Design a binder for this molecule. Structure first.
Ligand SMILES: [Mn+2]
Ligand SMILES: [Mn+2]
Lengths: 56, 293, 398, 70
């Protein structure tokens, strides 16, 4: 193997006639939630067996 | 064993916060536990959000206490220090002792990097050796603190996206996997990847160049853009030059200088600043003045 | 002008005839009577419908005392199960009360339509008018309450214009301040437009909508004919492409949007160029003019020039969302066919060349017979599908 | 739009002034920036700034800024 509506619905308290707390966003936000790869070893070993049989 | 060491280390924190130096055996045990806790740490330590990244301290202990009064106490807000907290300051042993004791007390809440001043030769020539002789009496505590500086991690990574280091980039470093492959367990050389890691600095150039420091290189916007694109980064945080406003966004919103030692060498009069990455990577700047004395 | 023009004589003084012949004894109804009619622990909609239907015939000055109970009881009129005359007739009574007591009515309606608590004043609403768009979630699919919210938002936007002008004029003790106020007003109106257009999206839980969409289209048409600079700023900012039919079919004022498509397509930013191409395509579907055909030819030339100048990843990012616009351009205008066709064959073979650059998991070159894949084979598939769409458009196009 | 059209290229030395012009604010932070703009016009401070982030350009000298003080 290997927006704006929900933004403005939740901007209470820290705003008002005062400036917002932050200074900006570093990038586009959180870098995904990160993907977790999942395999099963029997298919891996037997597809490898099939390919090495074809090569041999 | 854990309870008695925990309460003794808490009393060490409380005695350090009121600016009292420790004893040699206490520094021995602190340095040994620091060696044990820093052995299991990579060259690029992933620090999860949120975190308040602070810059150079350079042995200004009351300014460090003010910094804790601004950004938050050490139990409650995460900190990431990009080294250079040992020279050019009157109270040097207290600063490094406080950082190391906070590291071994709060192992997920304090991240400490390595600066260029945190080497045997530079501490010997620029003041830490003299401070060592004048307070503790002999040169042996300098030996423990130099070994402790030897084991410190080089860089850090915030949410896979922000790269925090002391100095700058390297002509020999292309990927972050090469940072993790370096032998960190050695004093910083005069030439090589790690000396450039702890010694380089940005400048408005078009390429590499000899830094006016005797070691390291200098890099421009093209190099920083290439490094950010090729590694999936968007920001390079560093702390190596004196800044009046305490923060600089150089190389077109890619390299961020964060200096956190107000009134550097007590005669420059700079207003320091630190960066506070929230849980949404949604930042703000805390900009502060030197402490009353 | 809407509030004063709903006051005018409609046809034949039918309302006067009704207030002559149906409200002989309406003194039994009282504001507090409507108060426990609403606040019954079951939902007896019959008696509240009785009271409000009798409340239609009264004059606005006689309808002043019922503003308290109506406004305080708007919030109950959001649950699943209210009959439609209750909502429509409360909308009518709100429109009647809007002709006499508008400012107090708006500042009272903000404090009632808020989600379930902060009591808001007129100064905060004039400083920031976007709390009007911070109403309850259920308001977004209630057409009368959204109509009330839209009139309220337009009123508070004009209010904020006047308030910022007055606060700038008072606090002199000058060109920079004036242009800063102009920029604040422009970004403010653009933000209001963008929030309204994002209300117009279908929500993810469902994936009455059309009523909210057409009401928001009416308000946006009024705001665009008020000043075209907001329209230019919004189309420079951009909105999701799924709104591009709805915004073009429903707002007539988008015709003047054909004035700045040459300017929008000339911006260095790339996603602005995709937005310009798509917006131009939908406009050419809507309005088929010589101006539209000329800007369409300019669009084809711009796409060819960007085909000359684009890196492969940026080529995919540019040419993936555009290509249905070429179907729209070909559907609007026959004389562009071969020109369109030329662009397709060029893009086709250049993508084909890219397929030969590296090994692929599908090998599409030998597939001349008919998920997460390689971007190049996706681009080739998009090219062949847009050719299929063009051909089936031409066959069934009579 | 006829034989005189050139698509503009991105300029590195652009300096996009986010307070002087509404055209330079991106969508994804727009409401954020809007509030900040409002704060400026409601700050009524001694000094009014037309830029959110004016850090420095190339060099931060101690002597240059220390001369502008008593
Ligand atoms: Mn230092
Ligand atoms: Mn340094």
């Amino acid at each position: 193997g290997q927006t704006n509506r929900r933004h403005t619905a939740a901007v209470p308290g820290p705003g008002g006639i005062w400036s917002v707390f932050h200074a900006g966003v570093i990038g586009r936000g959180l870098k995904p939630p990160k993907f977790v790869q999942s395999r099963n070893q029997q298919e891996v070993i037997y597809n490898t067996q099939s390919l090495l049989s074809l090569l041999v | 064993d854990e309870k008695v060491f925990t309460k003794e280390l808490d009393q060490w924190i409380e005695q350090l916060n009121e600016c009292k130096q420790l004893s040699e055996s206490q520094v021995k045990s602190l340095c040994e536990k620091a060696k044990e806790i820093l052995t299991k740490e990579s060259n690029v330590q992933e620090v999860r959000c949120p975190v308040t990244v602070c810059g150079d301290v350079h042995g200004q202990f009351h300014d460090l206490m003010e910094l804790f009064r601004i950004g938050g106490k050490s139990p409650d807000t995460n900190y990431l220090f990009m080294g250079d907290y040992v020279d050019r300051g009157y109270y040097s042993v207290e600063t490094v002792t406080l950082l190391v004791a906070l590291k071994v007390r709060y192992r997920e809440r304090i991240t400490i990097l390595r600066g260029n001043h945190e080497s045997r030769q530079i501490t010997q020539v620029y003041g830490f050796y003299d401070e060592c002789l004048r307070k503790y009496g002999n040169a042996n505590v300098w030996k423990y603190f130099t070994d402790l500086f030897d084991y410190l991690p080089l860089t850090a990574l915030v949410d896979g996206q922000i790269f925090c280091l002391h100095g700058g980039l390297s002509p020999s470093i292309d990927t972050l996997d090469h940072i993790r492959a370096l032998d960190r367990l050695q004093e910083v050389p005069h030439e090589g990847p790690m000396c450039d890691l702890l010694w380089s600095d940005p400048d408005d150039r078009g390429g590499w160049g000899i830094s006016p420091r005797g070691a390291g290189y200098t890099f421009g916007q093209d190099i920083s853009e290439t490094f950010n694109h090729a590694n999936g980064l968007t920001l390079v945080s560093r702390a190596h030059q004196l800044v009046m406003e305490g923060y600089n966004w150089c190389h077109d919103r890619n390299v961020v200088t964060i200096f956190s030692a107000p009134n550097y060498c007590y005669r420059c009069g700079n207003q320091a600043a630190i960066m506070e990455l929230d849980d949404t990577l949604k930042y703000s700047f805390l900009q502060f003045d030197p402490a009353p004395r | 002008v809407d509030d004063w023009i709903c006051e005018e004589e409609i046809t034949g003084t039918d309302a006067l005839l009704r207030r002559m012949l149906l409200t002989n004894n309406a003194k039994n109804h009282s504001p507090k009577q409507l108060q426990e009619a609403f606040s019954a622990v079951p939902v007896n909609n019959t008696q509240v419908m009785q009271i409000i239907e009798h409340l239609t015939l009264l004059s606005a000055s006689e309808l002043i005392p019922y503003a308290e109970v109506l406004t305080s009881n708007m919030s109950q009129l959001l649950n699943s199960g209210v009959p439609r005359r209750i909502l429509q007739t409360v909308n009518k009574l709100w429109m009647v009360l809007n002709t006499v007591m508008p400012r107090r009515l708006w500042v009272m309606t903000v404090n009632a339509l808020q989600p379930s608590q902060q009591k808001y004043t007129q100064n905060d609403l004039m400083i920031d008018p976007l709390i009007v768009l911070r109403c309850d979630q259920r308001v977004h699919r209630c057409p009368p309450l959204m109509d009330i919210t839209l009139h309220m938002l337009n009123g508070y936007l004009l209010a904020s214009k006047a308030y910022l002008s007055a606060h700038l004029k008072e606090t002199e003790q000058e060109v920079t301040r004036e242009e800063l106020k102009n920029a604040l007003l422009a970004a403010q109106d653009s933000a209001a437009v963008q929030i309204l257009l994002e209300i117009c999206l279908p929500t993810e839980e469902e994936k009455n909508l059309r009523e909210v969409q057409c009401l928001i289209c009416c308000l946006l048409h009024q705001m665009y004919i008020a000043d075209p600079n907001i329209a230019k700023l919004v189309h420079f900012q951009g909105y999701p492409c799924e709104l591009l039919p709805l915004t073009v079919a429903g707002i007539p004022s988008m015709h003047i949007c054909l004035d700045f498509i040459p300017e929008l397509i000339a911006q260095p930013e790339l996603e602005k160029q995709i937005f310009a191409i798509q917006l131009l395509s939908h406009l050419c579907i809507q309005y088929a003019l010589p101006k539209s055909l000329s800007v369409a030819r300019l669009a084809v030339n711009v796409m060819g020039t960007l085909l000359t100048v684009l890196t492969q990843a940026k080529r995919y990012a540019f040419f993936m969302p555009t290509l249905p616009s070429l179907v729209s351009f070909c559907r609007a205008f026959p004389p562009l066919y071969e020109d369109i066709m030329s662009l397709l064959i060029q893009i086709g073979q250049v993508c084909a060349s890219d397929v030969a650059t590296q090994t692929r998991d599908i090998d599409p070159i030998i597939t001349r017979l008919q998920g997460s894949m390689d971007p190049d084979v996706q681009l080739c598939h998009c090219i062949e599908r847009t050719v299929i769409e063009i051909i089936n458009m031409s066959v069934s196009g009579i | 739009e006829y034989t005189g059209f050139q698509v503009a290229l991105l300029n590195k030395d652009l300096k996009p002034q986010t307070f002087r012009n509404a055209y330079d604010i991106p969508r994804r932070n727009l409401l954020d920036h809007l509030t900040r703009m409002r704060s400026n016009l409601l700050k009524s401070t001694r000094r009014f700034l037309k830029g959110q982030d004016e850090d420095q350009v190339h060099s931060v000298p101690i002597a240059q800024m220390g001369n502008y003080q008593e």
